[PDB]
Amino acid sequence: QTNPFYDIGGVSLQNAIGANIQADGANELINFTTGVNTNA
Amino acid sequence: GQLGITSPTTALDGYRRLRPPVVANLATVKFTGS
């Protein structure tokens, strides 16, 4: 739901990012993509 | 069947397991003499 993700591609990517944020604040996304546990 | 004393204080890996060496009867002595 931010302009960089729009620049990366599509609006549905913003939809996916917003869905992850509403689910866990992108905790699982950050952990799975980068390997960093935001909320340990 | 609880052998021995039954007072109201006693109420409360792959290998073969052998039964403990426990007998089923105990000796009792009654003395009618003086």
């Binding site: 939809n15 996916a16 869905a19 | -």
Partner: protein, 55 residues
């Protein structure tokens, strides 16, 4: 409503459902471990009380 918002919210609710399903499995494991520990402690406490009465 609209044409795109409905699809967006449907996709989002699908993703949230999956993530929450995983988290629900994790929390169910948590609660099962909690209950097992509580049951063990309660049984030990009961037997301790029985020992004290016998003593």
């Amino acid at each position: 409503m609209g044409g795109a918002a409905i699809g967006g919210i449907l996709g989002g609710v699908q993703l949230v459902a999956g993530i929450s399903q995983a988290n629900s499995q994790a929390n169910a494991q948590r609660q099962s471990l909690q209950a097992q520990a509580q049951t063990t402690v309660d049984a030990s406490r009961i037997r301790q009380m029985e020992i004290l009465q016998a003593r």
